[model samples]
Target: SQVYFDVEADGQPIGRVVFKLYNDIVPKTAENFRALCTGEKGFGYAGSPFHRVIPDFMLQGGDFTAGNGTGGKSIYGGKFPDENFKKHHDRPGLLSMANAGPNTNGSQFFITTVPCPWLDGKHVVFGEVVDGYDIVKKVESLGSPSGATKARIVVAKSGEL
Candidate 1:
C-alpha cells in the first residue's frame, strides 16, 4: 500500500506525490507521519509552507506550526524514540524524517534531489516520492527563504499499487 499527497503552491496545482510508507519497517515513524497527513493527531500539513530549500540537495517542509521549519509537533506531543536506520538515502526523491538529533522525529521531512548516502544511518527513510518528480523540481526551483507560500498538503491516503 501507499499514500499520495497532492501538493499545491500558491493557489496553483503543483502535482500529486505518491509515497510508500514503510510501516512494518518503521512503524512509529510511519504512524507519526500518517497521523499528520490525515490531521488525526495534529493540525495537519495543509496550509503549511515549504520553509526550507536547498539547490542540488533537497526541499523540506511540513512545519504546520511556525511555517518556518522551526516548529512542528509530533503525534506523540513530544519527541519519539529513533527507529531503525536500515534504509539508505540512495537517490533523489527519497523522503526522510527531519530530526534535531537522535530520537527527535517530528512533522518535518525532506525530499532529496540527489543521492545522499551520508544521511543513510542518520535519518529515517520512511517514504519516497513515487510520482510528481517534476513537481518536486518545481518546488526546488521556487528557491529558498520564501519560494513556497501556502504550500499545503491537498490529500494523503493509502491504496493498492
Candidate 2:
C-alpha cells in the first residue's frame, strides 16, 4: 500500500501509476513484500535504487544490498514459498515478482510497458507504480536496455514514513 509514489526526472512530472499486490496468490512472496512495505520485522529498506529499467516494456528493481538482484545472496534460488494469489499483467506500474522458475521469486520485480494480459494470474502481481508512469517510460528508454539482469538498475526505499 505504501509502495506507490510519484516519479520525476530533473524535477519534471510523469504519468500516474499504481501497483497491486497479489497477496492472495503468492503468500510467501506477498509476506516478504508486505514486510518490506510495512517494515515489520525487517522494517528498514530505504534509499534502495531502481536497479533495472527497460524503456516502453518493463522497469525492474528491488531491495538488495548491491549488484541489485544478485546481491540478495539467498534470494535467487530460494523455493517458491507458496502460491496464494494469482493475477495477470495489466498496465504500467504493475509490480509483479520475477521468477527464475516457478517458485523462485525474490527481490526483483518488473513494471509493465503495455497491458500484459497473458501475464495475469501467472506471475504474482504484488504492487504498482501509482504515480510516475512516465518515469517508468523514460527508464524503459535508457542506456543498454535488455532483459532483467541486462538492464541493471538499483532500487532502494526509505522504510515508509
TM-score top scorer = 1
TM-score per candidate, chains pooled:
0.86, 0.66
Error of 2 at 29 (Å): 3.1
CA lDDT of each candidate?
0.76, 0.54
After superposing candidate 2 on the true structure, give the runs of residues whose Cα lies further than 4 Å from its correct spot. Answer: 5-28, 73-79, 82-85, 117-122, 147-156, 159-161
lDDT of 1 by residue, 1-161 (tens): 36666666656777777777888999888887777776755377766667777768888887878877788888888778788989899989888989898888878888899999988888989888877788788778766544443344332332334
Model 2, position 82, has a per-residue lDDT of 32
Q: In model 1, which regions exceed 4 Å deviation?
A: 144-161
Q: After superposition, how far is residue 32 of candidate 2 from its true place, in Å?
A: 1.5
State residue 97's C-alpha deviation in candidate 1, in Å: 0.9
For candidate 1, the 10 contiguous residues with the lowest summed lDDT are 152-161
